[PDB]
Design a protein around this nucleic acid. Structure first.
Lengths: 226, 85
DNA sequence: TGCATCAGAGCCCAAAAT
DNA sequence: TATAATGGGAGCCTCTGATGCA
């Protein structure tokens, strides 16, 4: 496989003769394709966190859970979502959508979820006071493509709803594998904290799984079609 | 011409084979410990099964004649081991 | 079935051989 | 026993019989 080029088929996948393995590589025979030496291992780590939101009662659609992409609310007019605690902002941005985490000292005092359609008005490390706008929400706001809502609680205060969302999503981290290293973990494997992913000559440069997650192989050195 | 039919190794391919060879030797050591069986004898049974039925013969140092009867017994003794062994 | 092409088979004796 | 090293080298008659192609 040409350097930097990522494979079309995945390790283990049954393959017909003539099928395209890589952008410039076409298979000559039927059989099982096998990854030889993956250069980059992408591990999607499993995170389950409880985060809040407040919306105009008229703009939100009542559901017990939200699948990725599902419409969360439709706002007649632009709405300013405001902080309910004072703290410093830790902004953590997903593919689309964001998480916002307020902390005083180092103890987190609030965790907010900004779905898509909600533009942060704050930046990482900004000091905020109760009632000041964190994010502008304009038009239709929906769940991001990579993140779900497993449980949805709604409290009603005045003209607003406060959603307590139990959110589940995977955060990718990439690891580079050097020629003297071997991947000790299979494609689609589940790893816990401490589990070895890639092995090497000396204890450092080893890849140990940071927390719970699933493993994906990219950029193989070559593909062996058997 | 026969030499030219085996492709040369990539640095990656070379390290992989070398790595597996070293590890295989460490494995033979462990099987000696577990079973209380001769490491050399173990190596010939392992090697016999990889090379296939084609080559099976007595080795000058081994105390037992190495024939499909004896290699089946020892191979069946190895396969009688617990999963982690 | 009839015909080239090639591989393999042979090519004096005795004397001597410095 | 440890830089890396990865595919060789010389070459010059007649008849008979079997074998491989019209």
């Amino acid at each position: 496989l040409p350097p930097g080029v990522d494979a079309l088929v995945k390790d283990g996948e049954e393959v017909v003769k003539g099928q395209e393995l890589a952008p410039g590589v076409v298979s000559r025979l039927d059989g099982v394709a096998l990854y030889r030496f993956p250069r980059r291992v992408r591990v999607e780590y499993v995170k389950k966190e409880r985060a809040g939101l407040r919306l105009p009662l008229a703009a939100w659609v009542e559901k017990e859970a939200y699948k990725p992409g599902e419409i969360l609310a439709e706002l007649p007019e632009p709405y300013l979502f405001r902080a309910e605690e004072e703290g410093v902002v830790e902004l953590k941005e997903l593919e689309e959508g964001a998480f916002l985490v307020l902390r005083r000292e180092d103890e987190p005092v609030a965790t907010y979820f900004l779905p898509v359609g909600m533009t942060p008005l704050v930046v990482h490390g900004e000091i905020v006071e109760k009632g000041q706008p964190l994010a502008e929400a304009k038009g239709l706001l929906r769940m991001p493509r990579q993140v779900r809502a497993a449980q949805v609680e709604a409290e009603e205060e005045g003209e607003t709803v406060y959603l307590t969302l139990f959110l589940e999503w995977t955060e990718p981290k990439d690891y580079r594998v050097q020629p003297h290293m071997n991947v000790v973990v299979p494609e689609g494997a589940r790893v816990e904290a401490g589990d070895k992913i890639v092995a090497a000559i000396d204890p450092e440069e080893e890849v140990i799984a940071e927390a719970e997650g699933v493993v994906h192989l990219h950029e193989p050195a070559s593909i062996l079609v058997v | 011409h026969e030499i030219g039919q085996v492709p040369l190794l990539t640095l990656e391919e070379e390290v992989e084979l070398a790595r597996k060879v070293e590890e295989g030797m460490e494995a033979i050591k462990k099987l000696s410990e577990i079973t209380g069986l001769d490491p050399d004898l173990i190596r010939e049974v392992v090697r016999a099964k990889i090379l296939g039925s084609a080559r099976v013969r007595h080795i000058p140092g081994l105390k037992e004649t190495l024939d499909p009867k004896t290699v089946e017994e020892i191979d069946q003794k190895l396969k009688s081991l617990p999963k982690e062994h």
